[PDB]
Structure formats: structure tokens, C-alpha cells
């Protein structure tokens, strides 16, 4: 599913991400934009042999099981295929673990390259929220 920007922003707010761990909703929308371009089906195979899944590009080395990643753990306790669905619940619940794991939103490399320290309040513009 490819979300619309405010459609995703509403979905995320409904799942408790606005100011979660002090991070504005705009931070979350900016990261999903630069991680997956709002597409729930996006995957990236890394050289690691790991793959990033879904709208927030969660990695299979630590967070979800895809059964092809050497030395993977499954900290979110889900199959990585569940992170490819049109409903964002599984992705958001896992992202809530990842953001509290100790590097805040620095865990998403596209957030730190394109969103960190910018006016992220621009990503929520025109969203009736």
C-alpha cells in the first residue's frame, strides 16, 4: 500500500507515535518518507545478508525473523513478512522498541541524514490532525 502523507500521519498518531519518547509526529513522517517513500512493501537487501522491511525499514538481523539472516535474533517476535502488510500496527509496535533501544531515532539512517535538526513540523502540514 503506498500511504498519502497525512493519511500516514493520522495512522501514526492513532498508534501513539506523536511525541513518543519526545519525538514529534513530523519526525516519524519524515523518517517513513526517506526510508520507504511511504510504501508498506519496500525491502532492501543489505550486504550483511540482512534485509530491511516495510514502511520503517526494520532490519532482519535483530528485529524480525525472515529465516535467511545468519545470526538473527527476533526481538520484536514477528516474521518480517508481517512488517510488509498494509496495516502499520506491527511496524509501529516494533519501532517503539527500536526507538527505546538506545540511539533514539538515530536507528533510522535516513532520519538522521534527511530529518535530524530540520524543521520537521513541515511534514505534518495541511494535515487535519
DSSP character string of the chain? -B--HHHHHHHHHHTT-TTBTTB-HHHHHHHHHHHHTTBTT-EEE-TTS-EEETTTTEETTTT-B-S-STT---TT-SBGGGGGSSS-HHHHHHHHHHHTSSSGGGGSHHHHHHTTTS-GGGGGTT---
What CA–CA distances, in Å, run from 43 to 49, 101, 111, 117? Answer: 13, 22, 17, 27
Residue 52 appears among annotated catalytic residues: yes
> Can you read off the three cell numbers belonging to residue 11?
495512522
Q: Where are the domains of the chain?
A: 1-129
The correct answer on CATH 3.40.718.10 for the domain covering 1-129 is no
Among residues 18, 35, 66, 87, the one annotated as catalytic is 35
Q: What is the rounded CA–CA span in Å between residue 113 and residue 93? A: 23
Among residues 18, 52, 66, 87, the one annotated as catalytic is 52
Question: What's the CA angle centered on 64, arms 56 and 81, to 5 degrees?
Answer: 75
101 labelled as ligand-binding? yes
Could you tell me how far CA 83 lies from the centroid of its own chain? 10
> Can you read off the three cell numbers belonging to residue 101?
533501544
Could you tell me how far CA 11 lies from the centroid of its own chain? 13
Amino acid at each position: 500500500k503506498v500511504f498519502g502523507r497525512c493519511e500516514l500521519a493520522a495512522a501514526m498518531k492513532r498508534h501513539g507515535l506523536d511525541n513518543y519518547r519526545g519525538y514529534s509526529l513530523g519526525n516519524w513522517v519524515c523518517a517513513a518518507k526517506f526510508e520507504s517513500n511511504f510504501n508498506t512493501q519496500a525491502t532492501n537487501r543489505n550486504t550483511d545478508g540482512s534485509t530491511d522491511y516495510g514502511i520503517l525499514q526494520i532490519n532482519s538481523r535483530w528485529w524480525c525473523n525472515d529465516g535467511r539472516t545468519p545470526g538473527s535474533r527476533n526481538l520484536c517476535n514477528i516474521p518480517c513478512s508481517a512488517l510488509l502488510s498494509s496495516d502499520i500496527t506491527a511496524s509501529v509496535n516494533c519501532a517503539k522498541k527500536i526507538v527505546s533501544d538506545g540511539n533514539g531515532m538515530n536507528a533510522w539512517v535516513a532520519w538522521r541524514n534527511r530529518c535530524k535538526g530540520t524543521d520537521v513540523q513541515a511534514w505534518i502540514r495541511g494535515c487535519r490532525l
